[PDB]
Each structure stands twice: as structure tokens, then as C-alpha cells.
């Protein structure tokens, strides 16, 4: 979760709304195991 601790303070003449970009990755201890077929993508038929 992301919570406003104090607030987003802005002076006059600057825009009153901003945007945040999240960037996700992994560490050097990350590992994977037991290869399979990916599930969260499909394919409607009649390819070519």
C-alpha cells in the first residue's frame, strides 16, 4: 500500500497534480523452478 504521510505540497504556478511510475524487478537471491506453459495469455484460432 501507499499512504500519504504528510501531503503533496505545491507552490503557486506549479501543477497541482503529479504522477508516480512504479518499477518492479528482483534481487540476486531470486530463483525459479519447474518450467511449465504460461497461462495468462491465449490465442484465438485461424492463425494465418
Amino acid at each position: 500500500s501507499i499512504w500519504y504521510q504528510t501531503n503533496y505540497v505545491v507552490p503557486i504556478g506549479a501543477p497541482n497534480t503529479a504522477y508516480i511510475i512504479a518499477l518492479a524487478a528482483a534481487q540476486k537471491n531470486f530463483t525459479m523452478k519447474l518450467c511449465k506453459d504460461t497461462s495468462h495469455i491465449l490465442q484465438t484460432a485461424s492463425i494465418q
Binding site: S1, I2, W3, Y4, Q5, T6, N7, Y8, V9, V10, P11, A14, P15, N16, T17, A18, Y19, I20, I21, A22, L23, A24, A25, A26, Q27, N29, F30, T31, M32, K33, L34, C35, K36, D37, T38, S39, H40, I41
Partner: protein
């Protein structure tokens, strides 16, 4: 580090670029909620827009730590503070800060 689509609310094709960045605005200072997202990469959600969440789909069992890396794209004259909490399992959606 690949982009996490936390703001996966917009659905129409004209607003699919609104899906990569979530806003922060001027609030009344009660400790409001900005955004929340599950930390499960192989699950269906924001992590499915990563090269971690597309390669962990080709695998069944994963281990190790993650890291989310937020970046602020507001003005230089703007200041502020945010609390970024990882609530481990069992914890429901927290109602307040």
C-alpha cells in the same frame, strides 16, 4: 526494472497509456490512501506487465525477494512524503495508516 501497471482501471484503447502512472494530489492531511496492489508476480494483476511476471508464468515455483522502485515525475518545487508499506499475509486490506 520494468514498469508495473498499478493503475489498471482504464480499459478502452484510448486510455491504455493512463495505465502506467498513478497520481498524487493535494489532500486534507488525514493519512489518506493513494494506491494498493498485491505483491504476487505470477498472479493476474499489475505484475503481468513485467518481464518478471511474464517469465514467472513459464515457471511454477519461485523464491527470493522482490523490489519495487517508485519514481516521482512531478515538479522540482513540489515536496511531499509517502509511506510505502508491505503488509505480510493474513493482514486484510488496512483501513488506515
Amino acid at each position: 526494472e520494468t514498469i508495473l501497471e498499478v493503475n489498471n482501471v482504464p480499459t478502452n484503447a484510448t486510455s491504455l497509456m493512463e495505465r502506467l502512472r498513478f497520481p498524487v494530489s493535494a489532500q486534507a492531511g488525514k493519512g489518506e490512501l493513494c494506491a494498493v496492489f498485491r505483491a504476487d508476480p505470477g498472479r493476474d494483476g499489475p505484475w503481468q506487465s513485467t518481464m518478471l511476471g511474464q517469465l514467472c508464468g513459464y515457471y511454477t515455483q519461485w523464491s527470493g525477494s522482490l523490489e519495487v522502485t517508485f519514481m516521482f515525475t512531478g515538479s522540482f518545487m513540489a515536496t511531499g512524503k509517502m509511506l510505502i508499506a508491505y503488509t505480510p499475509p493474513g493482514g486484510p486490506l488496512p483501513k488506515d495508516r
